[PDB]
């Protein structure tokens, strides 16, 4: 086509979706990770995670307002990944890299798994 | 912070949100523009438009499944802008620029209004 493109549009959209998350506006699901609860937008979770994409396209699970993750999932690892989904920024640290990678594998977040594997390979 | 950032994340999220739109997955509102209907995600509309942000943060309108636009709004202009919201690409043409700019002013899409004004100023 003969379209023009606004370079910053996708980043501005994501910034606004994160603002809605921060103010709890139009969040439509709670993700339960053991004793912790995380409110989010189903569409953003699906756009970032192969696991959430599969969950919310299921004819029954699409209507659930609460999703319980596997008890092996670390709440901090999930928190770091949820922040990444809404910001593109990943808080990867020596102390959290193992939990973050395990959570990204479970959530099916391929690019996150890739950088975790590379950061681990560099420190061995 | 000491975060790392994935450059393509925001664009990949938007691409996935557009895929959900194309398959009518988790769309939660119909925008009526005269005889035409456009299904969308409230969160994406709010993230792109000052008008939709104001509408869906209203304690009553946030719960509406149908939103009727002003009858002066051109369905093609709205269609072009809805595509822009989900893709960052604007199909701006001599034949549609006036309708697109008028629709972007009504929807409060400042960057779109700006490029329309510049493209119009160049042709005068």
């Amino acid at each position: 086509d003969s379209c023009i493109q606004f370079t910053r549009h996708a980043s501005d959209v994501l910034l606004n979706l994160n603002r809605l998350r921060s103010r709890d506006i139009l969040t439509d699901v709670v993700i339960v990770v053991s004793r912790e609860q995380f409110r989010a937008h189903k569409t953003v979770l699906m756009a970032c995670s192969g696991l959430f994409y599969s969950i919310f396209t299921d004819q029954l699970k699409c209507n659930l307002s609460v999703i319980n993750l596997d008890p092996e999932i670390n709440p901090e690892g999930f928190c770091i990944l949820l922040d990444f989904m809404y910001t593109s920024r990943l808080n990867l640290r020596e102390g959290n890299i193992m939990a973050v990678m395990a959570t990204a594998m479970y959530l099916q977040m391929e690019h996150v798994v890739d950088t975790c594997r590379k950061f681990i390979k560099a420190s061995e | 912070d000491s975060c790392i950032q994935f450059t393509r994340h925001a664009s990949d999220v938007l691409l996935n949100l557009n895929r959900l739109r194309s398959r009518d997955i988790l769309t939660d509102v119909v925008i009526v523009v005269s005889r035409e209907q456009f299904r969308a995600h409230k969160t994406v509309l709010m993230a792109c438009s000052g008008l939709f942000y104001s509408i869906f943060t209203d304690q009553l309108k946030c719960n509406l499944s149908v939103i009727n636009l002003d009858p002066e709004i051109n369905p093609e202009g709205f269609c072009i802008l809805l595509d822009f919201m989900y893709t960052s690409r604007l199909n701006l043409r001599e034949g549609n620029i006036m309708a697109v700019m008028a629709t972007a002013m009504y929807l409060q899409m400042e960057h779109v209004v700006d490029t329309c004004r510049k493209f119009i100023k160049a042709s005068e």
């Binding site: 023009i4 493109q5 | 604007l90």
Partner: peptide, 4 residues
Amino acid sequence: WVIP
């Protein structure tokens, strides 16, 4: 704005 750019030519994509």
